[PDB]
Amino acid sequence: TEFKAGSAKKGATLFKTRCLQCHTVEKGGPHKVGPNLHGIFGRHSGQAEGYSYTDANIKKNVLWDENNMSEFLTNPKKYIPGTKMAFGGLKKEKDRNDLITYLKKATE
């Protein structure tokens, strides 16, 4: 167990300032640069259709669990070299933890 639930709220504001530019959470939500994250958890990587992931991403074949999501969140490229996703990553866990809190609710 290496994830403590946080502020859904704060997670929610971190997403906008940080993943909105390229993602949408809404079920019925459209893809933009990155894909629509509706129902990511318990889901493997490179699987939203209508979406063109790198070969890197497909291959990775990560199961989207709260805990995976933190590691990837840490440093994307380092987690999945090849991914087109342009994101440096959230160094602090507190931050990481909050947003995962956000995704958890919102992606349900």
Any residues with CB less than 8 A from the CB of 51 and at least 6 apart, and which?
Answer: 31, 35
What distance in Å separates the CA atoms of residue 57 and residue 68, rounded to the nearest whole number? Answer: 14
Specify the residue for token string 């640069």.
Answer: 33
Query: Given candidates 24, 47, 74, 75, which one binds ligand HEC under the rule CB under 6 A?
Result: 47
Task: Based on the shown chain and the rule CB under 6 A, indicate whether residue 5 belongs to the binding site for ligand HEC.
Answer: no
Beta carbon nearer to ligand HEC, 4 or 59: 59
Task: Based on the shown chain and the rule CB under 6 A, indicate whether residue 24 belongs to the binding site for ligand HEC.
Answer: no
Site for ligand HEC in 70-99 (CB under 6 A): 83-87, 99
What distance in Å separates the CA atoms of residue 46 and residue 1, rounded to the nearest whole number? Answer: 26
Task: Based on the shown chain and the rule CB under 6 A, indicate whether residue 101 belongs to the binding site for ligand HEC.
Answer: no
